[PDB]
Amino acid sequence: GSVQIVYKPVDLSKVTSKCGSLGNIHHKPGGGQVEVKSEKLDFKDRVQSKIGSLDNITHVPGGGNKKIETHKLTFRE
């Protein structure tokens, strides 16, 4: 068997965004309290967690466009 595979995708995509102004943004929350109490913590075998936190994230990009492509060609035998 003469397998012949041609993989030719053509891509001319625009992901654009215009913006006049981003303007005044005020991120003024209040204070908080987080209290976690535990004694035994046994972790193993590909674990990743978070125990007790407080975040004030202000993420203001001037255009936060994403483009995620994925080309996957799997061949077996």
Which C-beta is closer to a copy of itself: that of 29 or that of 62? 62
Q: Which residues contact 63 (CB under 8 A, 6 or more apart)?
A: 17, 19
- Sole window of 12-20, 33-41, 52-60, 67-75 interacting with a copy of itself (rule: CB under 8 A): 12-20
Six token digits for residue 71: 């080309």
18 lies in the site for a copy of itself, by CB under 8 A: yes
Which C-beta is closer to a copy of itself: that of 11 or that of 55? 11
Q: Helix (H, G, I), strand (E, B), or coil: what is residue 76?
A: coil
Amino acid 41 reads: L
12 lies in the site for a copy of itself, by CB under 8 A: yes
20 lies in the site for a copy of itself, by CB under 8 A: yes
